[PDB]
Design a protein around this ligand. Structure first.
Ligand SMILES: Cc1cc2nc3c(=O)[nH]c(=O)nc-3n(C[C@H](O)[C@H](O)[C@H](O)COP(=O)(O)OP(=O)(O)OC[C@H]3O[C@@H](n4cnc5c(N)ncnc54)[C@H](O)[C@@H]3O)c2cc1C
Ligand SMILES: CN(C)c1ccc(O)c2c1C[C@H]1C[C@H]3[C@H](N(C)C)C(O)=C(C(N)=O)C(=O)[C@@]3(O)C(O)=C1C2=O
Ligand SMILES: CN(C)c1ccc(O)c2c1C[C@H]1C[C@H]3[C@H](N(C)C)C(O)=C(C(N)=O)C(=O)[C@@]3(O)C(O)=C1C2=O
Length: 368
């Protein structure tokens, strides 16, 4: 055990950081997770996640959590519709595929992971602001909270991580598309037409450079996403002002059936976010003052257009913890290096599929 008298600090308790903690902890490795969120009941904004066979489900299997993911997750059909609300295609989940990639709510998934860990593995209300290599141990600075030390830092703190410099100088880039996401509670009441259009399935529609995506049943809330090429004029919409978002969306969707509009009218608040990528373009720094690495979105943030986001992040966790558990390597540095080499290959494959899908979707005639 390379980590025998040592401790690991995982930065970020997202699905990836928590899975990592779990895989380490079951091999007797001393690990803490430092998480920005105030407490375990903070709501996680966003849609559902789905775990794939051969990747995310493998990580959950190794964690002893796969059945638990199954119990909480929900297989979903997919309806493809036009802007007029015609159903162009309906694909239901066949009994035999119910386990392929059922949708799970992000708080549900967090709860499964947190529960699997020993008490006080996760330290809440810990926003890592700075890292500093000492002689043997990293010193870790948390906003308005005591400092901590660790022999190995694993950054799992998401695609906007600000603390990556000791691993790489690569920066996040905007890919050119933009996403507006929102929730509607009691959608059966609040967007009845649209809710009926989804009819228990996820829904996707495409028209004139505007893509709309919806999951009508994220623990009872409807989550939708509207994606388009970032307008040249952008910024000119303020996401704190629902009126300017509504104005923009109604103009973009003026062509769409009234049920889609009702969706935009009824939404209380929208989150706007530019699609981004942390490109696995150049190798990471091969000289590092102490052992440090990155997994999940911190390592390979990619556009959310291929479902590869969480799954490749779960694989990282699986590959890194395997490496770190086995006296298969001479040093933590070697265990990390070997993990990073593998991740560059499947990571880069996932990024290319995300990028390619993103391009393919936003061309003049896209048809799902
Ligand atoms: C709009 C959108 C839709 C998406 N849809 C999908 C999808 O359908 N399927 C899919 O696979 N992927 C999707 N993705 C990506 C997916 O959500 C992430 O890949 C997934 O959550 C795994 O990421 P992670 O654990 O590596 O990082 P995150 O989920 O981002 O978690 C990072 C964690 O670190 C914490 N943190 C951040 N800063 C600090 C700090 N300084 N100190 C301590 N903690 C910190 C955060 O609070 C968070 O808990 C989507 C992304 C976006 C933006
Ligand atoms: C073959 N066996 C009778 C059946 C029949 C119908 C089923 O729907 C299922 C099984 C086996 C079990 C294996 C169990 C196992 N475990 C007891 C939790 C298990 O770990 C697996 C697995 N793939 O490792 C499952 O798929 C599993 O979670 C599962 O989803 C099953 C399952 O869905
Ligand atoms: C159609 N498109 C190419 C694909 C292909 C494979 C996929 O696995 C997926 C998509 C679309 C994207 C839509 C994105 C959307 N957005 C870009 C984040 C989105 O808002 C939703 C949603 N339900 O609200 C998704 O389903 C979504 O997260 C998702 O899970 C997708 C997804 O899983």
């Amino acid at each position: 055990n390379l980590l025998s008298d040592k401790n690991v600090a995982i930065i970020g308790g997202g699905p990836v950081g928590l899975t990592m903690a779990k895989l380490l902890q079951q091999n007797g490795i001393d690990v803490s997770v430092y998480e920005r969120d105030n407490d375990r009941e903070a709501r996680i904004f966003g849609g559902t996640l789905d775990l794939h066979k051969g990747s995310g489900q493998e990580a959950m299997k190794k964690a002893g959590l796969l059945q638990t993911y199954y119990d909480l997750a929900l297989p979903m059909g997919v309806n493809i519709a036009d802007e007029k609300g015609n159903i162009l295609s309906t694909k239901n989940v066949k009994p035999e595929n119910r386990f392929d990639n059922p949708e799970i709510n992000r708080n549900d998934l967090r709860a499964i992971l947190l529960n699997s860990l020993e008490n006080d593995t996760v330290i809440w209300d810990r926003k890592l602001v700075m890292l500093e290599p000492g002689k043997k141990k990293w010193t870790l600075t948390f906003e308005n909270k005591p400092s901590e030390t660790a022999d190995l830092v694993i950054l799992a703190n998401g695609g906007m991580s600000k603390v990556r410099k000791f691993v790489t100088d690569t920066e996040v880039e905007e890919t050119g598309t933009f996403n507006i996401q929102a929730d509607i509670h009691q959608p059966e009441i609040n967007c009845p037409g649209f809710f009926q259009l989804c009819n228990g399935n996820r829904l996707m529609a495409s028209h004139q450079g505007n893509l709309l995506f919806a999951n009508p049943n994220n623990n009872g809330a409807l989550h939708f996403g509207i994606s388009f090429k970032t307008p040249d004029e952008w910024t000119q919409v303020d996401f704190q002002n629902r009126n300017s978002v509504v104005d923009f969306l109604l103009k973009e969707f003026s062509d769409w059936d009234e049920r889609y509009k009702e969706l935009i009218h009824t939404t209380l608040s929208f989150v706007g976010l530019a699609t981004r990528i942390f490109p696995l373009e150049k190798p990471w720094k091969s000289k590092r003052p102490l052992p440090i690495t990155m997994i999940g979105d911190a390592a390979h943030l990619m556009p959310p257009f291929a479902g590869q986001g969480v799954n490749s992040g779960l694989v990282d966790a699986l590959i890194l913890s395997d490496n770190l558990a086995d006296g298969k390597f001479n040093s933590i540095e070697e265990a990390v290096k070997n993990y990073e080499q593998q991740m560059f290959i499947y990571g880069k494959e996932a990024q290319e599929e995300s990028t390619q899908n993103e391009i393919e979707m936003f061309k003049p005639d896209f048809t799902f």
